[PDB]
Amino acid sequence: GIFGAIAGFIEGGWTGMIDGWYGYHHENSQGSGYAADRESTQKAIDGITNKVNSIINKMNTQFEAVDHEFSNLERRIGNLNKRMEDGFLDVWTYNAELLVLLENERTLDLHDANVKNLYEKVKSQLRDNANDLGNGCFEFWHKCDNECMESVKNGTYDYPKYQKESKLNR
Amino acid sequence: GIFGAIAGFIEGGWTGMIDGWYGYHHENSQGSGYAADRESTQKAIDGITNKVNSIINKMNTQFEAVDHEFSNLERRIGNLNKRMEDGFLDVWTYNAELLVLLENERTLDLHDANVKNLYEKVKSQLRDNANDLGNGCFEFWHKCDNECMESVKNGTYDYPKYQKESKLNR
Amino acid sequence: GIFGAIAGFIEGGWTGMIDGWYGYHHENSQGSGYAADRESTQKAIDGITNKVNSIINKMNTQFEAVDHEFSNLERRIGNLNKRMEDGFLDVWTYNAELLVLLENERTLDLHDANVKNLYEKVKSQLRDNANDLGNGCFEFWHKCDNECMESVKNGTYDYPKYQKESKLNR
Amino acid sequence: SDKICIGYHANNSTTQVDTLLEKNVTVTHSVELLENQKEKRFCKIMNKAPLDLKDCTIEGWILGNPKCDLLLGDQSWSYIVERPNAQNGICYPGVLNELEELKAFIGSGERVERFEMFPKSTWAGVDTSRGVTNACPSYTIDSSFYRNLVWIVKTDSATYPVIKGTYNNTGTQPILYFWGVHHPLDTTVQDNLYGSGDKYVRMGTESMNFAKSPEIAARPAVNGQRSRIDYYWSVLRPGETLNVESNGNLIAPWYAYKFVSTNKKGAVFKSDLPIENCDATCQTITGVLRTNKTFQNVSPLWIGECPKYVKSESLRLATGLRNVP
Amino acid sequence: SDKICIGYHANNSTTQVDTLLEKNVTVTHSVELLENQKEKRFCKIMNKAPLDLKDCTIEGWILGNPKCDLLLGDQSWSYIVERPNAQNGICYPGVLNELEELKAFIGSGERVERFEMFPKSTWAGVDTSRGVTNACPSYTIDSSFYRNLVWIVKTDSATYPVIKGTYNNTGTQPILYFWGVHHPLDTTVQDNLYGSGDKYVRMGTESMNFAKSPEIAARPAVNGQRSRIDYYWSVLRPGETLNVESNGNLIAPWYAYKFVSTNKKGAVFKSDLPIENCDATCQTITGVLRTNKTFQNVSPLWIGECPKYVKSESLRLATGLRNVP
Amino acid sequence: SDKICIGYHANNSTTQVDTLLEKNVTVTHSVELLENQKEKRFCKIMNKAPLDLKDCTIEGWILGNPKCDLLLGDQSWSYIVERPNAQNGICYPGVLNELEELKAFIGSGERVERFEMFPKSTWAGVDTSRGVTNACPSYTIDSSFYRNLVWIVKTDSATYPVIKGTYNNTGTQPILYFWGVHHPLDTTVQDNLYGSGDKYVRMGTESMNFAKSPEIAARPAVNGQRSRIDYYWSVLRPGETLNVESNGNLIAPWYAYKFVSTNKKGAVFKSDLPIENCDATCQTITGVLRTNKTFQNVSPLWIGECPKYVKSESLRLATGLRNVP
Numbered sequence A, B, C: 001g002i003f004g005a006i007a008g009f010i011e012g013g014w015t016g017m018i019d020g021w022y023g024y025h026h027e028n029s030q031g032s033g034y035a036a037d038r039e040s041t042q043k044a045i046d047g048i049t050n051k052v053n054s055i056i057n058k059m060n061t062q063f064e065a066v067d068h069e070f071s072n073l074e075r076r077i078g079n080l081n082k083r084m085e086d087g088f089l090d091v092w093t094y095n096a097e098l099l100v101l102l103e104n105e106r107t108l109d110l111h112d113a114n115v116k117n118l119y120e121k122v123k124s125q126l127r128d129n130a131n132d133l134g135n136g137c138f139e140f141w142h143k144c145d146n147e148c149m150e151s152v153k154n155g156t157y158d159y160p161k162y163q164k165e166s167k168l169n170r
Numbered sequence D, E, F: 001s002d003k004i005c006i007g008y009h010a011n012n013s014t015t016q017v018d019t020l021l022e023k024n025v026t027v028t029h030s031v032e033l034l035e036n037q038k039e040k041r042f043c044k045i046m047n048k049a050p051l052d053l054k055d056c057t058i059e060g061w062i063l064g065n066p067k068c069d070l071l072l073g074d075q076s077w078s079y080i081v082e083r084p085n086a087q088n089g090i091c092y093p094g095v096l097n098e099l100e101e102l103k104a105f106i107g108s109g110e111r112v113e114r115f116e117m118f119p120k121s122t123w124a125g126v127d128t129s130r131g132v133t134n135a136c137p138s139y140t141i142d143s144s145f146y147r148n149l150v151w152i153v154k155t156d157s158a159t160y161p162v163i164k165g166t167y168n169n170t171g172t173q174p175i176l177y178f179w180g181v182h183h184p185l186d187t188t189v190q191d192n193l194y195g196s197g198d199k200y201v202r203m204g205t206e207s208m209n210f211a212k213s214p215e216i217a218a219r220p221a222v223n224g225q226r227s228r229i230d231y232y233w234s235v236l237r238p239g240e241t242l243n244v245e246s247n248g249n250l251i252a253p254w255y256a257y258k259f260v261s262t263n264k265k266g267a268v269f270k271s272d273l274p275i276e277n278c279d280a281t282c283q284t285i286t287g288v289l290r291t292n293k294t295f296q297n298v299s300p301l302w303i304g305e306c307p308k309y310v311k312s313e314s315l316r317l318a319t320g321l322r323n324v325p
Ligand SMILES: CC(=O)N[C@@H]1[C@@H](OC2O[C@H](CO)[C@H](O)[C@H](O)[C@H]2O)[C@H](O)[C@@H](CO)O[C@H]1O
Pocket: F133, F134, F185, F189, F221, F224, F225, F226, F227
């Protein structure tokens, strides 16, 4: 990726996160697991689906080649027809083949960005109440139960509460 | 946005910032207000204008269909002409419709990036003399009057002054 | 660039870094110099080369215009031929000219991103064992000899080891 | 210590895509936009069966070659299938003038109704019943003639008089019809069949005229004939009238077709492929496609609603992300 | 505590654009690239008025149908407007040979000057002063003839002699000219008009020759005529000379046109629309566009400098950002 | 204090590229995709030399104009170079029928072998040994005739009898051949050369027939001739036989060409440029390109393997980054 996250300062993905494209893995005293971020996953499913359908929709016309015959005194128009029919075939073949190449590049970047932005959102809340650890993982300088985990995921963390334990554990 | 800022870790725009595309909102003892960043707005206007004019310029040729008639013994070339004329019409209709779709995607990303880069510039001056907050706002660890506000915007902040005041407070 | 680094919160490049596209400039007691990051440079050379070769490959067909003559009673098909031949010339000229315009925009962005990501990698290892000056430079809060320099470049820095030394000095 | 980590999906996919930057990139999800499968057969389109000309060409069918009787009468068709080795076409050697424009006009239609345009009694003072030839047999009679034309010759007794005929197309449909001019190999046969004297065939309509004269000459033998016929065709439009006038050498129109034009585009497929009792919405010269895909690499020639033809082997668009399990 | 925030513009815009990722995205600023407005009329182009053929077709105009006198003489035009119900064309039934190639040649021009190419005295020993027909009347004389042709008949007394004429094109401009051959319905009329004997019309030039013989036959009545005329046209190039030779059945050239070709491309619009005193730089078959936009969905047919025709309803490009007020 | 800095490459490049966002951007590395250099000459293609028609046109070459003897016999070619001011074409005034289609058929070939198709003795009871004209001289004899045709006239003594000839193409190659029909200026010359009576030329094949009659008339003088010849050409396919029959006015086939078609596409270049002893893989009408680039703005007309033609002056793709030294 160009945003640097997927394969990656976050090397590798998660076969265990079954319900989304991007999300979270946590571990604390009550246990551990995987959980998708629904909002960003869904918003990406809608975008990519729209991209596919827009491409399908814009490509939805056809050049129609034709079976007409030509006499031995119509070599010139016969060949005009052939040169024309191959001409449009070459134009459309190019358009499709290049579009796919370009769009696949830009689709990987989009996913890469969405992962990066998720990571950055978490980073802004936590600040120095956690230690980065460089693989897209954060070690809390404090006790973070499930309610505190959901806190981080829904965007309502509360740095002031925890700044306490966090500083002295630091 | 792909850069994460517009709608957004900065949810919502500002109807009250009338004079630019990107800029600043401040609040202090003397009051509050809005002010565009002229350098980045202008540099985006130049880029988008160039993009529009480059598209206009490359699209500035025409396939010219023709009113010629064909006899009841010229069904084959009559139809060659029709198939050709519709062929180029379909090619150009595709090129235009897809270009607009693609370029509008990329234009929103550009605005998104410029907002994010403004945020990053301010972040670099302020450092730990302010607290990030995550919504594109910075809370000063110190008294920042209007002259100090203009300071931030014109790129001449002066971390060393402030610093002592900021550390006690943080 | 859109990522904000090249010309730039890092204004200016380095004529003295001869062996790569992106890399490092260091200074310490043993001396100073310039050194490319091979991994990221190479990975960009492979990507750009692939891009160039893909464009070459997809453009590897030709519309073939033809020298056939037409009588004074074949003004209509003569002109059908001309209109067709110019038609494809206008389509291919557009495709090539726009592609170049678009791809050059996106190639600069790629370089810009790779410089930004390099900068961010170094920033994550160093943390508060160094101070951000501005042009993408870091001043160490500690003595960093060549082995420590290589340490930063190869991604193995060891924050714990210079943390006590770095905290005094601040 | 408690961790929270940010990350992304992986799965067991081994499907790959290309990008401008990188080839063979494995992704979690993708969609293929191109179809490369076909059923190798011809099916009905819009519930209408195609017309199998079997061992006849378009020429043989439409002129009424006596070995093309199974096709005789009314026909309706979604498209036409001409078998590439069909043997029964022009039995009596000669050229069908504007053949390519005829093959195109026929292809633009969807039905014909055969009817007697000029009965044999139209032609006064001539023999309409011995106009027959071994170049041109049935399966039973080895000397016959096209079922839509009459080879008129003079009576033993007499002179070949001036003969006339008129047909007013008072219907709503245009009529496709046919005639010819006989070109004997030498003077003796000219005199036998038509008598001596400068001969002509003239025809006319509110919008066309025609006039030809016999060109007597021995040409190379084809199905035993060193004579020839020049065949001609035309379309009498609704409201138009046809006048025929000749004093010799006329191969006269007898039966013709009320022709009904397709608002669509039509097709003529030259193919070996079988015709089966199946329905389809897209039929290519090399087979039917049943697909929802927007591209195909089977054939540029078709009828119905097909996908855009391209030369690609594959057009796979990434939807998911890079798969790193 | 004092706050400085970073942010972006919003406004009261409700204008939307589409992207690959998302439809109906409201943006702060945008530009529409496609024109869909037209004025439904024909205007001058390059200050030159178009030529309104009114109740005449191109054929009627250029042959000199007597009801097309208001068009007679010199004309200059930016383009041609032929009204789809025009009544006055070929008055005396027959075919104008290579009609489509004539309609195309005329369209490629910008002026004609009418002049007497062969005066009536050119033709010795014949009557040039009858040659008139009720199929082909003025508004005042109900038996007349094309103003650019002479129907030559023999004098009461005599035989139709061999007649000859020559014209050397010593000008700088090519000449568009016309002739015909009469095909009477029967022998009696042939003998009345031209006498008995094999008849011919021959014409020639350094680069063309022509030879036709009358084809006598009754064809269906059109404006009371069962005879026909085959009309012909050609272009005598600068420096070329024309020789005419006939002993009967010639409809002779009388007046012709010095023709001046456009370096541009020209147009022939078949339309009902009014012609008004207005200027324009872009004229489509369905109206004028006055626009700076680079696309349009009005018509693919035009003259002047128009925008590229596409099938879109709209082509709106985002300039500002997503609007979130 | 110790620094470590992150940064990017710069160099002494002054080369620029354009982007949608910005014009004239200096970059460290770039690649030009468009070729604008050519060698202004014609070279061999696939080791085969082109054919230089020098002071002859295609017509003159292929009819055997006596001033085109240096081209006479067998030829092999990669392409054909016709010089734009070539003087020696049709010497005896007339039209070569279907000229553009002949120029196209010839261009699709790669070799011809010249051979006697009908020896003069083929034609019984006529004079084959005059048939010569001052309109049509060698460099030495100022009264001659096309080397591939015979102008037959009757003997002083006698009548012009019916003459006949046949040729069975038993070979594997198609044959390109030529004939004509003489059109005298007046009756006296008709009678001199061919005698009185209705005259004809008829020809035929398993798949074509031809019949023409002389059209006597004085046409404008061209190289001293007010008579004309209509020239004709055709292709006798392998297995086919040709029968010729005439009683007057035949310009008979004498020599013809066994023609071998190119599986490739062929070219006919109308150009002044020199032909040199050089090899090439891409030859344009205006010069050879030796390049690896994928675009070019030299010419749309070529043979061999050339790059795609476009109107651009330049197509420079950035590879490195923005250069800020
Ligand atoms: C009687 C006379 O001298 N007539 C000349 C002729 O000059 C020439 O034409 C004759 C054929 O008539 C022949 O071809 C000869 O080679 C040629 O010099 C012409 O007959 C005529 C135009 O062709 O012009 C007369 O002045």
